[PDB]
Design a protein around this ligand. Structure first.
Ligand SMILES: [Ca+2]
Ligand SMILES: [Ca+2]
Ligand SMILES: [Ca+2]
Ligand SMILES: [Ca+2]
Lengths: 21, 140
């Protein structure tokens, strides 16, 4: 259930770790 | 892994798999990132996928999806995630803000399903998720 939010943020974070200014 | 966390992942994957075709394209990631207040460029999106595209087919399937969550499950970034939920910035995510964010990811949730979520994140029982409780949830 709370894994919905959770993984939302995982890919969220997975983007952060891939930004290019 | 338990039966419960598979079924969680599944719906997790399905938040992204807008069109139900069993894969997440860059367009779907783009769409979700933006619903989360972000603005990733075509290239960023490609990298995200490139990083876990084992079959090199250009899209994310379930297995690779879980890979992503395996990998990120290895600070400053945490606050920014939190601020996405804590819409009024008072430092507590209420159910309403949680509901709003879910709805914003195209979820239709029953009042009670929102509450269950609040309830599983909520450590101290004040019925809201604070930063530090948000942190634990981002630590599993
Ligand atoms: Ca898709
Ligand atoms: Ca793939
Ligand atoms: Ca708030
Ligand atoms: Ca709390």
């Amino acid at each position: 259930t709370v894994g919905k939010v959770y993984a939302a943020l995982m890919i969220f974070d997975f983007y952060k770790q891939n930004k290019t200014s | 892994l338990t039966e419960e966390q598979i079924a969680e992942f599944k719906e997790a994957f399905s938040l992204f798999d807008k069109d139900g075709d069993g894969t997440i394209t860059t367009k779907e990631l783009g769409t979700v990132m933006r619903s989360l207040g972000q603005n990733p460029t075509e290239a960023e999106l490609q990298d995200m996928i490139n990083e876990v595209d084992a079959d090199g087919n250009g899209t994310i399937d379930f297995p690779e999806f879980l890979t992503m969550m395996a990998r990120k499950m290895k600070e400053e970034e945490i606050r920014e995630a939190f601020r996405v939920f804590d819409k009024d910035g008072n430092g507590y995510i209420s159910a309403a803000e949680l509901r709003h964010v879910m709805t914003n990811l195209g979820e239709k949730l029953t009042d009670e399903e929102v509450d269950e979520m609040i309830r599983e994140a909520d450590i101290d029982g004040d019925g809201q998720v604070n930063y530090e409780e948000f942190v634990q949830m981002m630590t599993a």
